[PDB]
UniProtKB/Swiss-Prot annotation, chain D:
Self-association state and partner proteins as the record states: Complex I is composed of 45 different subunits.
UniProt similarity note: Belongs to the complex I NDUFA12 subunit family.
Parent-record interval covered: 107 to 144 of 145
Organism of origin: Bos taurus
The name this protein goes by in its record: NADH dehydrogenase [ubiquinone] 1 alpha subcomplex subunit 12
Subcellular location(s) per record: Mitochondrion inner membrane
Record function comment: Accessory subunit of the mitochondrial membrane respiratory chain NADH dehydrogenase (Complex I), that is believed not to be involved in catalysis. Complex I functions in the transfer of electrons from NADH to the respiratory chain. The immediate electron acceptor for the enzyme is believed to be ubiquinone.
Curated annotation (Swiss-Prot), chain E:
Organism listed in the record: Bos taurus (Bovine)
InterPro entries hit by this protein: Complex1_LYR_NDUFA6_LYRM6, NADH_Ub_cplx-1_asu_su-6
Summary of subunit composition and partner proteins: Mammalian complex I is composed of 45 different subunits.
Gene name of the record: NDUFA6
Annotated keywords: Acetylation, Electron transport, Membrane, Mitochondrion, Mitochondrion inner membrane, Respiratory chain, Transport
Subcellular location, record wording: Mitochondrion inner membrane
Protein family: Belongs to the complex I LYR family.
Name of protein: NADH dehydrogenase [ubiquinone] 1 alpha subcomplex subunit 6
Ranges that cross the membrane: none
Lineage: Eukaryota, Metazoa, Chordata, Craniata, Vertebrata
Swiss-Prot record, chain F:
GO cellular component, one term: mitochondrial inner membrane
GO molecular function: NADH dehydrogenase (ubiquinone) activity; NADH dehydrogenase activity
UniProt entry tagged with the keyword Oxidoreductase: yes
Organism this protein belongs to: Bos taurus
Alphabetically ordered keywords of this record: Electron transport, Membrane, Mitochondrion, Mitochondrion inner membrane, NAD, Oxidoreductase, Respiratory chain, Transit peptide, Translocase, Transport, Ubiquinone
Name by which UniProt lists this protein: NADH dehydrogenase [ubiquinone] iron-sulfur protein 3, mitochondrial
Protein's GO biological process: mitochondrial electron transport, NADH to ubiquinone; mitochondrial respiratory chain complex I assembly; reactive oxygen species metabolic process
Cell compartments where the protein resides: Mitochondrion inner membrane
Coverage span on the entire protein: 45 to 252 of 266
Homology family: Belongs to the complex I 30 kDa subunit family.
Reaction catalyzed: a ubiquinone + NADH + 5 H(+)(in) = a ubiquinol + NAD(+) + 4 H(+)(out)
EC number: 7.1.1.2
Curated annotation (Swiss-Prot), chain I:
Highest taxon, organism lineage: Eukaryota
Subunit structure: Core subunit of respiratory chain NADH dehydrogenase (Complex I) which is composed of 45 different subunits. Component of the iron-sulfur (IP) fragment of the enzyme. Interacts with NDUFAF3. Interacts with NDUFAF7. Interacts with CERS2.
Protein purpose: Core subunit of the mitochondrial membrane respiratory chain NADH dehydrogenase (Complex I) which catalyzes electron transfer from NADH through the respiratory chain, using ubiquinone as an electron acceptor. Essential for the catalytic activity and assembly of complex I. Redox-sensitive, critical component of the oxygen-sensing pathway in the pulmonary vasculature which plays a key role in acute pulmonary oxygen-sensing and hypoxic pulmonary vasoconstriction. Plays an important role in carotid body sensing of hypoxia.
Parts of the chain that traverse the membrane: none
Shown chain mapped onto the complete sequence: 357 to 463 of 463
Protein's recorded name: NADH dehydrogenase [ubiquinone] iron-sulfur protein 2, mitochondrial
Family of the protein in this entry: Belongs to the complex I 49 kDa subunit family.
Coiled coil: none
Subcellular location: Mitochondrion inner membrane
Length: 117, 84, 688, 38, 114, 208, 71, 123, 107
């Protein structure tokens, strides 16, 4: 149940599990989330901007315990330490990529812990 | 010019302006029957010191400030700026 | 006198004999839960949520529809009432799907602010959940009819205020539905105003659909200016962008309703907007430049001009602070010759105590009228909520309405009395009946529209209608004070414009060839370069580029109406100031400060700097404009009705046809209505 | 499915540094002037 | 006013107190300018002292001036000793700040009326 | 009623209804309101004329020891026509009892401080000066604790906004670390959270 | 205008897109009235929701489910 | 005692920097977010100050800003102490008015008529 | 957890099935609880002292004033009495006996 790097998950063959229900935003204590949504032309709503202020992020992890469709996951990898302040502000196209550098690391920890919570 | 326009102010109560409320009964129907060119103005309520304005000469204000007149004092004060 | 002390939870209060238990318990500062009830609607009872246990009775009654007898003990909190408010709001929370991640009323639904406070803790159902299908009605009402807890609230609104008989109830028992049986679209005036009434998130807005949740907005109250009756709105920002509006529910006008046009006209507000000063370049070329290029360009031209060579027009939607800095500039140079866009005939009066120029009856005094006669206008497709007050005051008592000229589709039982201008002359005599009833009424009401008055016989019908109007006033008049003759408008910045002392109707610019003009008209194309002399410059000052910015010399960016602390005048003379919610984009500035900034680069400099100092100047001309939201009792037109008798211009011969079409004229109206892609999206859906 | 080949790195400039940017739309859509003739 | 004062009674125990510590500042301005090892001219310091006292001269009520006396005296506690390490004394002078325009034509080219 | 509801008791609700009653009986000079909390707490509302002697009466007795000064706090309340609210909290050592002293005041009106009565108020009393400006009387050393040296705000009241005005920055223009007007990278988006429909029946206001 | 901040920084960008990846799914069919969608597995994924499939043989991906569902 | 009764309108200053004379406050009633019908959020006067510019922060598009106050709402009790707080610190303001609606006359049973017009159908 | 679920969130296997679970889940994170008014106070044994919290409640999801008392206010103002008459090398040996931690003197 160790916390760490943020990442986003998706369904079997890619679906963007996020539904942009904004609940992770309203419980972030540092307001590191900022989301602008829009009806995509297919009809189902998705995201346009998606931000995690990894500077401001105080790691209360409540985003992991607030999503109903279980989208955002604190991925257990402490690999970090870049060289600018201008880099750690994660946009969306880090996070889906960062959520897809691995999934079997993530998908086994949820599946061993979801019975408790 | 002189002049451009004049602005009548009054009040619906505080009965010092009853001379003006009489003046419309006396000289508004005949006062504008003569000179059908000058666009004189009437507004609603100053509620204290119902002044009477005049404005002309590259936009210069001229305010005669009636407080509480009689029915002829409002009739004679108007022709001072009107003839000039 | 005429009361019963009823001990609401053992505490006395005196109501009228014949009110409701709901209004009794709401008077002492309590809320019983409300689903099948609305104050601005009729009363049904088919949700059965208000259930109070009355004392000295084993049964439970509902507070919606029953009177109150001799003084009871309305036991609000009991050990049985909470066995009822838990009871009913366990059933209807079962046959319902698991939305609200995605339900767009997700921060204000009444299954979500009742269900924490009242009601149970868990569920025991435990499978079921019927699922009906949805459809589409118009391109405005996003439609999920699954949720639809059948509170019969949208259904009665078709028989209520909006008189379109379109909806119904299709089905029996568990399976009934709400939507129209056939695929007939539903769109008229007020047709987008149902999505406030639907108490759950089954109905919502189509353009707003998937944007943002309602706990992030900043509610700042303001006023809309797209009609002459004003509005009572509330905007909501996100990051300095406008999201949506809702009606602010003022009790005189905008009761719980709002104009259907103004609801979705905000789209073009941020669509096609000019942001920056664009230089002349000598051909039809027009490119941007420094803000301190085109100021000194026109500053030397001002001192070269003198006399009637320079003029201006203004008939759009601008405030009453930039219509004084213009006036204190062009009359400090002492060269007035200035007018508006709208065609209002002036023969005897209008500028001088104005005597009829506002809507004389209050909107609150409309319901006390008994016989209404109106000519020469379409009340449905200009001032839409005006017909809503007629519709409601046609109901709930007797009200008699006749009409002269061009039968259009009004909702209620009107009748075409006739169509000629000679009808207006013959009603001073005794002919074409009702004949006496306008005199033999107790609160008569005679309304003139500005669309027929725009014609060339305007000064003729101005004295023809007021002939029989004072004839009723010299009769009794009513009892009574009861001002009868009144008039309407359809441009917001006209009554505010004229009572500053402007002349109405384009005649002074229609006679001379002036050199430089100021455009605040501006899209109303009654003045072109065709009626102008040769290629001397005309300066545009505004916010959009529909008509008059291509035909221009130097354009000026400016804030529209949602960016400045403005001040407007309704059709009765109130002042309902708008306030700043979003600061304007580009290099545009506030439209009175630019004139003082243009004054200081010119010779003459105006003696007021801040917006308070503007209002000190606004005190000088007219003192009713700082009198907020009051209509004083002042008519004084015994004399002014006699003075228009000096003019005896005769009528014309033409059927009194309004510009308003079946529906289509309602959409493309002002400036933003043309620029809004939303109105263009729906107007192609009507002609199809 | 949608997973990478081998791995990557969290390096400072490889030359690549991910250089995070803005991902929205222009809102006001400023007006276009008409063309060169009058 | 049903309220007891702090030190003064009416305006005459007051106005002799604002004159009083003015001399304590006046011998302090040459004393600290070689102490905190900063380099301006010393007369600028004496101008800024009387700058501060003269600006608040629009008071016609006691115990507010007396409230500023407690504020004015507490300034000297850090000042006579060394409790402001070469920054807080420099904080009095808006030195590297860009100038405010304060002119109507100058405000109009830059800013949405700040 | 059930499990998972706090079991209240009546013994401590009895004696604390008993003990504090004859406190107002024996000093009807300063006491203006006494109330018993529904969970064994006591408030003794005192006009601040008797700021010293009532404490001095609770300083020593044979039926009330109360020599453990725990908590001096300060609570502002706008819309009261006398804003602030100094609230003590003291402890009886021999008796295991808590009682608070609520004394209102205003801004400019001083308060006779508790310096001879208690010597634990040495750093607590100065804090209200630094944060509000409530000038206590006759304190031997009034100074500046827990704030920076150049503030003029007394920040813990309500008109002081969330950030100050004093966002600090460095430049190499000469050596200095200079002040500047405040500039944020983000609004601190302020929400709107108060749901309607009045979840509480007991605290219902007088309906006017 | 903004194109100068990444010179020698190579613009690390995403490769796949879920803008349109629903459309490559074998759109399901049942021939019934109302179906559960606990897709992705039980107790994970999107919550249970019931859809009427009578009208142009489809459901509409349930919003939540995302997978094209029909008959 | 040293009571020394005197009179002055209490205008306090020195605690802010310059925004006394610059801004103008506003006292009004929040009135019924009309997506629903809960009337608990009446009965309390609030305040809000002037709104100034919100630009774009050219790295993300965040709503970074100047205008240092911009978020200050207090909870007042009534109209009486509404004015008395704006004058006690002393900057300019402007006051709205509380709107309470009609009582009003609503009665079921008159929705079934013999000759009247108040008659519902299709229920 | 506490079972009545106006305070505790419901379980994860519950907030994906029933209707009653989400409305008492989705609302419980937008706003918080519903706390009654009336002042309160308590303290417990911190391992270096008492721990005063005078939590003023107002009646909404957002609390009013929350003043804390931590040790070190008493435990270090009384360094004046404790120190004098002694050396300078004594003074550093004094401080590590009271066990004073900063950031905790922020009360
Ligand atoms: S984790 Fe939840 S709240 Fe956050 S973006 Fe995804 S669906 Fe929305
Ligand atoms: S990780 Fe922590 S700081 Fe970031 S959104 Fe989640 S709870 Fe907030
Ligand atoms: S739209 Fe839905 S909630 Fe509204 S009345 Fe119809 S069924 Fe009821
Ligand atoms: S409308 Fe009501 S029941 Fe439907 S999703 Fe929203 S809160 Fe839930
Ligand atoms: S509330 Fe409408 S019937 Fe009970
Ligand atoms: Zn599914």
């Amino acid at each position: 149940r160790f916390r760490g790097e943020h990442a986003l998950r998706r369904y079997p063959s890619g679906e963007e599990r996020c539904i942009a229900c904004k609940l992770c935003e309203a419980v972030c204590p540092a307001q590191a989330i900022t989301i602008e949504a829009e009806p995509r032309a297919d009809g189902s709503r998705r995201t346009t901007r998606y931000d995690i202020d990894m500077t401001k992020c105080i790691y209360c992890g409540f985003c992991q315990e607030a999503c109903p469709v279980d989208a955002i996951v604190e991925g257990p990898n402490f690999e970090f330490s870049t060289e600018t302040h201008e880099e750690l502000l994660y946009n969306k196209e880090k996070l889906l990529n960062n959520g897809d550098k691995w999934e079997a690391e993530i998908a086994a920890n949820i599946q061993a812990d979801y019975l408790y919570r | 010019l002189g002049l451009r326009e004049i602005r009548i102010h009054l009040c619906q109560r505080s009965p010092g302006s009853q001379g003006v409320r009489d003046f419309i009964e006396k000289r508004y129907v005949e006062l504008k029957k003569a000179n059908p060119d000058l666009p004189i103005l009437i507004r609603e309520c100053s509620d204290v010191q119902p002044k009477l304005w005049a404005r002309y000469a590259f936009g210069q204000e001229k305010n005669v400030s009636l407080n509480n007149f009689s029915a002829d004092q409002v009739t004679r004060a108007l022709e001072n700026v009107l003839s000039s | 006198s005429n009361l019963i002390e009823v001990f609401v939870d053992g505490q006395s209060v005196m109501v009228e004999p014949g009110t409701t238990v709901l209004q009794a318990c709401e008077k002492v500062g309590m809320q019983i839960p409300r689903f099948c009830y609305h104050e601005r609607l009729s009363v049904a009872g088919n949700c059965r949520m208000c259930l109070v246990e009355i004392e000295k009775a084993p049964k439970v009654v509902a507070a919606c529809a029953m009177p109150v007898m001799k003084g009871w003990n309305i036991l609000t909190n009991s050990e049985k009432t909470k066995k009822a408010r838990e009871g009913v709001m366990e059933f209807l929370l079962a046959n319902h799907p698991l939305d609200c991640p995605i339900c767009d009323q997700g921060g204000e639904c009444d299954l979500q602010d009742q269900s924490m406070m009242f009601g149970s803790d868990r569920s025991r159902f435990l499978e079921g959940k019927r699922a009906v299908e949805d459809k589409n009605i118009g391109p405005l009402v996003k439609t999920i009819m699954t949720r639809c807890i059948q509170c019969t609230r949208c259904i009665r609104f078709a028989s209520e205020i909006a008189g379109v008989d379109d909806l119904g109830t299709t089905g029996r028992g568990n399976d009934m539905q709400v939507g129209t049986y056939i695929e007939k679209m539903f769109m008229s005036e007020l047709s987008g105003n149902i999505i406030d009434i639907c108490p759950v998130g089954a109905l919502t807005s189509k353009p707003y659909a998937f944007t943002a949740r309602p706990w992030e907005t900043r509610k700042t109250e303001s006023i809309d200016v797209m009609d002459a009756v004003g509005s009572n709105i509330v905007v909501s920002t996100r990051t300095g962008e406008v999201m949506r509006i809702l009606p602010r529910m003022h009790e005189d006008i905008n009761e719980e309703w709002i104009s259907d046009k103004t609801r979705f006209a905000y789209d073009g507000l941020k669509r096609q907007r000019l942001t920056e000063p664009m230089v002349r370049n000598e051909k039809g070329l027009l490119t941007h430049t420094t803000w301190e290029d085109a100021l000194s360009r026109v500053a030397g031209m001002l001192q070269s001009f003198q006399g009637n060579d320079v003029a201006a027009i203004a008939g759009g939607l601008v405030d009453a602070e930039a219509l004084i800095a213009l006036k204190d500039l062009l009359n400090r140079v002492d060269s007035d010759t200035l007018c508006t866009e709208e065609v209002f005939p002036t023969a005897g009066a209008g500028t001088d105590l104005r005597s009829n120029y506002l809507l004389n009856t209050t909107i609150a005094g409309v319901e006390e009228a008994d016989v209404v006669l109106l000519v020469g206008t379409n009340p449905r497709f200009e001032a839409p909520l005006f017909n809503a007050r007629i519709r409601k005051s046609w109901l709930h008592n007797d009200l008699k309405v006749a009409l002269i000229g061009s039968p259009v589709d009004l909702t209620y039982r009107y009748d075409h009395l006739g169509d000629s201008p000679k009808i207006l002359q013959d009603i001073a005599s005794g002919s074409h009946p009702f004949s006496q009833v306008l005199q033999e009424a107790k609160k008569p009401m005679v309304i003139l529209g500005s669309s027929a008055l725009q014609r060339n016989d305007g000064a003729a019908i101005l004295a023809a209608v007021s002939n029989i109007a004072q004839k009723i006033r010299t009769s009794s008049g009513v009892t009574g004070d009861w001002k009868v003759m009144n008039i309407l408008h359809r441009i917001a910045s006209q009554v505010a414009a004229l009572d500053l002392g402007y002349k109405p109707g384009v005649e002074a610019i229609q006679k001379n060839p002036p050199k430089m003009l100021f455009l605040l008209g501006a899209d109303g194309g009654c003045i072109t370069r065709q009626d102008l002399p040769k290629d001397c410059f005309i300066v545009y000052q505004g916010h959009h580029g529909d008509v008059g910015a291509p035909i221009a010399d130097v354009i000026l960016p400016g804030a529209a109406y949602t960016e400045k602390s403005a001040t407007y005048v309704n059709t009765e003379g109130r002042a309902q100031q708008t306030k700043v919610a979003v600061t304007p984009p580009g290099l545009a500035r506030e439209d009175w400060k630019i004139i003082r900034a243009l004054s200081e680069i010119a010779g003459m400099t105006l003696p007021y700097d801040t917006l308070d100092q503007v209002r000190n100047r606004l005190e000088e001309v007219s003192p009713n404009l700082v009198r907020y939201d009051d209509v004083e009792g002042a008519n004084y037109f015994q004399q002014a009705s006699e003075l228009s008798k000096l003019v005896n211009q005769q009528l014309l011969a033409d059927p009194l046809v309004p510009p308003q079409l079946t529906i289509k004229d309602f959409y493309m109206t002002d400036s933003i209505s043309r620029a809004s892609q939303t109105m263009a999206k729906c107007v192609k859906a009507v002609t199809e | 499915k949608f997973i990478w080949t081998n791995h990557k790195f969290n390096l400072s400039g490889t030359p690549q540094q991910y250089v995070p940017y803005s991902t929205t739309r222009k809102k006001i859509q400023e007006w276009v002037p008409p063309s060169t003739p009058y | 006013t049903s309220v007891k004062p702090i030190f003064s009674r009416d305006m005459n125990e007051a106005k002799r107190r604002v004159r009083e510590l003015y001399r304590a500042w006046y011998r302090e301005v040459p004393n600290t300018v070689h102490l905190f090892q900063l380099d301006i001219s010393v007369k600028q310091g004496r101008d800024k002292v009387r700058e501060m006292f003269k600006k608040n001269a629009h008071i016609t009520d006691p115990r507010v001036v007396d409230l500023l006396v407690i504020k004015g005296k507490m300034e000297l506690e850090e000042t006579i000793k060394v409790w402001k390490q070469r920054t807080h004394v420099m904080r009095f002078f808006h030195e590297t700040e860009a100038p405010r325009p304060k002119d109507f034509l100058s405000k109009f080219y830059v800013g949405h009326d700040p | 009623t059930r499990p998972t509801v706090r079991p209240r008791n009546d013994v401590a609700h009895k004696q604390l209804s008993a003990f504090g009653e004859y406190v107002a009986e024996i000093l009807p000079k300063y006491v203006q309101q006494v109330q018993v909390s529904c969970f064994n707490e006591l408030e003794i509302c005192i006009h601040p004329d008797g700021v010293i002697p009532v404490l001095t009466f609770l300083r020593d007795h044979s039926n009330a020891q109360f020599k453990s000064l725990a908590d001096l706090t300060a609570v502002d309340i706008p819309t009261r026509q006398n804003r602030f609210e100094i609230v003590y909290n003291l402890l009886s050592l021999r008796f295991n009892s808590r009682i608070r002293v609520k004394t209102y005041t205003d801004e400019l009106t001083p308060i006779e401080s508790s310096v001879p009565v208690y010597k634990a108020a040495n750093w607590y009393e100065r804090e209200i000066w630094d944060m509000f400006g409530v000038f206590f009387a006759n304190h031997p050393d009034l100074r500046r604790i827990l704030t920076d040296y150049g503030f003029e705000g007394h920040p813990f009241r309500k008109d002081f906004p969330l950030s100050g005005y004093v966002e600090l920055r460095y430049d190499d223009e000469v050596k200095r670390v200079v002040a500047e007007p405040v500039e944020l990278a983000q609004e601190f988006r302020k929400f709107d959270l108060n749901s309607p429909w009045e979840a509480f029946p007991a605290y219902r206001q007088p309906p006017e | 205008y903004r194109k100068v901040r990444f010179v020698g920084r190579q613009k690390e960008v995403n490769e796949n897109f879920a803008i349109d990846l629903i459309a490559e799914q074998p759109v399901s069919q049942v021939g019934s009235r109302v179906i559960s969608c606990d897709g992705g597995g039980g107790a994970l994924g999107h919550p249970r929701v019931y859809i009427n499939l009578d009208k142009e043989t489809k459901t509409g991906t349930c919003g939540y489910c995302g997978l094209q569902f029909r008959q | 005692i040293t009571v020394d009764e005197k009179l002055d309108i209490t205008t306090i200053t020195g605690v802010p920097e310059e925004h006394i004379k610059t801004r103008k406050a506003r006292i009004f009633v929040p009135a019924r977010n009309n997506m629903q019908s809960g009337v608990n959020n009446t009965k309390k006067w609030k305040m809000e100050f002037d709104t100034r510019e919100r630009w774009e922060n050219p790295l993300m598009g965040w709503a970074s800003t100047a205008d240092p106050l911009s978020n200050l709402v207090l909870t007042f009790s009534t109209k009486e102490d509404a004015v008395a707080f704006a004058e006690k610190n002393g900057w300019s303001y402007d006051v709205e008015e509380r709107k309470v609606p009609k009582p009003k006359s609503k009665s079921y049973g008159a929705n079934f008529s013999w000759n009247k017009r108040t008659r519902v159908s299709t229920k | 957890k506490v079972d009545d679920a106006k305070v505790s969130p419901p379980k994860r296997a519950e907030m994906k099935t029933s209707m009653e679970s989400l409305i008492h889940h989705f609302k419980l994170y937008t706003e918080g609880y519903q706390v009654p008014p009336g002042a309160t106070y308590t303290a417990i044994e911190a391992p270096k002292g008492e721990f005063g919290v005078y939590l003023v409640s107002d009646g909404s999801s957002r609390p009013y004033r929350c003043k804390i008392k931590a040790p070190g206010f008493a435990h270090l103002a009384g360094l004046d009495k404790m120190s004098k008459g002694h050396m300078l090398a004594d003074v550093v040996a004094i401080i590590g006996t009271q066990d004073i931690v900063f950031g905790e003197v922020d009360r």
